[PDB]
Amino acid sequence: GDISDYGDPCSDDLKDYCIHGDCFFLKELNQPACRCYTGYYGSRCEHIDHN
Known about the structure:
- By secondary structure, this protein is mostly beta strands.
- It has one domain (1-51).
- 8% of the residues lie in helices and 20% in strands.
- It contains one helix and four strands; from the N terminus they run αββββ.
- The chain has one helix at 12-15, and strands at residues 21-23, 34-36, 40-41, 47-48.
- The strands form two sheets. A two-stranded antiparallel sheet has the order 1-2. A two-stranded antiparallel sheet has the order 3-4.
- It is elongated, with a radius of gyration of 12 Å.
- It starts with 11 loop residues before the first helix and ends with a strand.
């Protein structure tokens, strides 16, 4: 279920990678990777669904 167990916790540098996204550093990937949740938009998840 969780993700932290599958991938180590992002660093302070990634903590502010996305405006409204979740940062997760996957060990197996050995690289940064952020995912944009549903409802939000923007290059870095800066915009939000308001209409």
